[PDB]
Amino acid sequence: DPTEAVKELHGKILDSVNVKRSMPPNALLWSLIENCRKEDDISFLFDALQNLRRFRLSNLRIHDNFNCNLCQQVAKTCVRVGAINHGKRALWKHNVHGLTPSVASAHHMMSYALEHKN
RNA sequence: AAUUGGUUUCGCCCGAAGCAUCGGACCAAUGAUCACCCAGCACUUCUGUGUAACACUAGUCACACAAAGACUUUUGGUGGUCUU
Ligand SMILES: [Mg+2]
């Protein structure tokens, strides 16, 4: 059901976060979010988004969340894919993925809703 | 005449488990010291993407860009050495 480009990225940084015990460089996380097409990869992106939040504090002792521009780009990834239920989770104040709510995410949701006419 | 069993002690042969002492051996971990790889805090962008004025639709600032950069410094890994 998912795509191979996001699957082979996903298992790669899961192998890095669980076996090598070093955090993966953010370039491949970004190339994971740039390659999402169908409905059935954003849950694997959420699994990665959860594992990285775990590892950043667990090993590297990093307390803050993912940053605001990353919130906008994961919002635009999910809303261009079309999963509205997964996209609206990006504005949640209490989430396991560390997605700080912002305004640009709601702007992207309202832009898609403008195009979709709901 | 011959004959059967003990019990104690001493000299030789072999050496179960064990404690002791050496020896290679970086065996398996731990500590130290080198390097190498990500990432973070400071930063600079002619880089893309959003907020807010204005200007008629372009500019100007605020941001995070991780998108790079290059000295530092830290967290975690990796690979060598300690008269091991
Ligand atoms: Mg013996």
Residue in A2, A75, A69 with CA at minimum distance from that of residue A40 = A2
DSSP state of A61: -
Which element (helix H / strand E) includes A56?
helix A42-58
Calculate ∠ Cα A77-A82-A87, nearest 5°.
60
A111 CB closer than 7 A to any strand B atom = no
Cβ burial, residue A115 (10 Å; 0-12/13-18/19+): exposed
Per-residue tokens: A93: 């104040």
Entry resolution (Å): 3.0
Residue A23, SS3? coil
Q: d(Cα A49, Cα A56) in Å, to the nearest integer?
A: 11
CB-proximal positions of chain B, under 7 Å: 37-40, 48-51, 63-68, 75-78
Task: Let me know if A100 is exposed, middle or buried by CB neighbors in 10 A (0-12, 13-18, 19+).
Answer: middle
Q: Which of A90, A77, A88 is nearest to A33 (CA)?
A: A77
Which tokens belong to A76? Answer: 């635009």
